[PDB]
Design a protein around this ligand. Structure first.
Ligand code: UHB
Ligand code: ZN
Length: 207
């Protein structure tokens, strides 16, 4: 069921998505070890992801969350990086693949910082880098991120240095040390996210 529609760079949606991508880059505490060294991206393509089945599954779960939370879905647009981006656009997010814990347990993780999600494109901690050059800071190979619509509902606030918590629909990882970091979020149901844009890009070598 999935089709990908290419957005023209003149399209206002292309521009607003690119801007969210570029404006949410930050420096990382690993000095670029996992995701490479860059201050900005070269955006090659932005595709709208269209799948009726996945979308209806999302909206159904969204209405359920909403009715449990005074008609407030608490919906965000957030980044997701993964080696399995092709499976996600075709089959949706699936929480059964969330074995190993990150900071907030076995769940599906999303980031406000595009550069944080970029650290996971080639695997946990960047894995071994691009498949062609084995370089976590490769400037040649094309990368992809998803920009996703995520239902947070009532989110458990975790100050920060499986199931949702009882009475909650998600977890929010609030940074409590690094003053420039944006939040990360965790959901425990795959139907609480819809992978709306597929962005293909390169990281750019600083001048
Ligand atoms: N349909 C599917 N087929 C194959 N893999 C699928 C899938 N749906 C989700 N996944 C994948 O399962 C994986 C998963 O849940 N995991 C593995 C990693 N882990 C740590 C984590 O996600 N940290 C983390 C923290 C902050 C941002 C980002 C990430 C990952 N991507 C980001 O943008 C939490 C549990 C994940 O890598 C996801 O992409
Ligand atoms: Zn490469």
């Amino acid at each position: 069921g999935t089709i990908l529609i290419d957005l023209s760079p003149d399209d206002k949606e292309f521009q607003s998505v690119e801007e969210e991508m570029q404006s949410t880059v930050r420096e990382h505490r690993d000095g670029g070890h996992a995701g490479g060294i860059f201050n900005r991206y070269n955006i090659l393509k932005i595709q709208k992801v269209c799948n009726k089945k996945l979308w209806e599954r999302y909206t159904h779960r969204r209405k359920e969350v909403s009715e449990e939370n005074h008609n407030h879905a608490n919906e965000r647009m957030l980044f997701h990086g993964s080696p399995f981006v092709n499976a996600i656009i075709h089959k949706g997010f699936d929480e059964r693949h969330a074995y190993i814990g990150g900071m907030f347990g076995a769940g599906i993780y999303f980031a406000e910082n595009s550069s944080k999600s970029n650290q996971y494109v080639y695997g946990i901690g960047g894995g071994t880098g691009c498949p062609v050059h084995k370089d976590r800071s490769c400037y040649i190979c094309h990368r992809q991120l998803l920009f996703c619509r995520v239902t947070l509902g009532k989110s458990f606030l975790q100050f920060s240095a499986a199931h949702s918590p009882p009475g909650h629909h998600s977890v929010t990882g609030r940074p409590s040390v690094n003053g420039l970091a944006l939040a990360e979020y965790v959901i425990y149901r795959g139907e609480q996210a819809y992978p709306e844009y597929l962005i293909t890009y390169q990281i750019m070598r600083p001048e």
